[PDB]
Amino acid sequence: MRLLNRHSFVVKRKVSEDGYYNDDGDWVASQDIVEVNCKGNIQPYIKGSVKNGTQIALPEGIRLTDTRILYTTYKLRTSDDVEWNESDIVMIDGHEYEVFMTMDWSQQLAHTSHYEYIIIRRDKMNAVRNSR
Amino acid sequence: MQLETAELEKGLVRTLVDVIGHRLARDKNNRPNVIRAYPSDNSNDKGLKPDQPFITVYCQDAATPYGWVLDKFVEDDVVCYRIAFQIPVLITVNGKGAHSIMLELKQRLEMSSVRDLILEETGATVLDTGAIPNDYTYLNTDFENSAPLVVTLVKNSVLKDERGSIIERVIVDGELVYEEGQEPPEYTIHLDVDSK
Known part of the structure; x- marks a missing residue:
């Protein structure tokens, strides 16, 4: 419906699910990454000690943590060790948001079936590769 | 040889695949499940928990209880230093029968063999x-049996001091005097010695 499609964002799904552990023990993420276009709705998540755009003071400097809730009809998936697949990524404001939680309301009713996700801004860190 | 825990962990992981690989589960590539702790790639990707039973290798820290410097020598014109280190490592088995596997792993690290392979790799x-x-940890639904173990290692590391230099020429001067402070010396000896 109209309100469920107010926002348009990009989603990076690792289509391949062939991640494995090297002969040295390091983790190697699935190789084939694919970009997609999706539509949904993004709002701040107000609950308990959740931190939306909260500035954090540390001895090392300053951080910024954010988290949101997303309503959409697209089936995004989080990490699953039994099915052996990794989570998706959602691009908001040019930054990455990793899908951490999911709530399956699909197949409940005709016109109001949807999904809910809690997406957390990814922390800043340097990059390293282990590919075999 | 330089000391780097990133290489010690890899060597231990490669050795364990042959030493105790027959008791562990195997992945889609038929490789036994031995991994380094806190798996991650590309600075944000996170590895999944393998199928049990598996092993995890994690280096705790490094200390120098044996003095501060062991040797100082010259190998080529560049100066060198040698330092003695100690590295405790933590190996854990997760699954069912973790204790039964850790016992056999203990009984194999003490053999005359295996200890040679470890030195060959690391x-x-x-x-x-x-x-x-x-140990037993509840997780959710069911408990998980685990069995940690600590194996300490010893290694010597060598580094190159690129700022150093060597003495190859010496110039010496001397005097002789009947009495202390004799302003005009009785005799003066000047010497010069080259390496060549």
Whole structure:
């Protein structure tokens, strides 16, 4: 419906699910990454000690943590060790948001079936590769 | 040889695949499940928990209880230093029968063999091996049996001091005097010695 499609964002799904552990023990993420276009709705998540755009003071400097809730009809998936697949990524404001939680309301009713996700801004860190 | 825990962990992981690989589960590539702790790639990707039973290798820290510097020598014109290090490592088995697997792993690290393979790969010697507890953690639904163990290693690391230099020429001067402070010296000896 109209309100469920107010926002348009990009989603990076690792289509391949062939991640494995090297002969040295390091983790190697699935190789084939694919970009997609999706539509949904993004709002701040107000609950308990959740931190939306909260500035954090540390001895090392300053951080910024954010988290949101997303309503959409697209089936995004989080990490699953039994099915052996990794989570998706959602691009908001040019930054990455990793899908951490999911709530399956699909197949409940005709016109109001949807999904809910809690997406957390990814922390800043340097990059390293282990590919075999 | 330089000391780097990133290489010690890799060597231990490669050795364990052959030493105790027959008791563990195997992945889609038929490789036994041995991994380094806190798996991650590309600075944010996170690895999944393998199928049990598996092993995890995690280096705790490094210390220098044996003085501060072991040797200082010249190998080529560049100066060199040698330092003795000690590295405790933690190996854990997760699954069912973790204690039964850790016991056999203990009984194999003490053999005359295996200790040679470890030195062949990592270039380090096994110094000690602690006791094995029998832990249970609830997780959700069912408990998980685990069995940690600590294996301490010893290694020598060498570094190159690119700022150093060597003395190859010496110039010496001397005097002789009947009495202290004789302003005009009785005799003066001047000497010069080259390496060549």
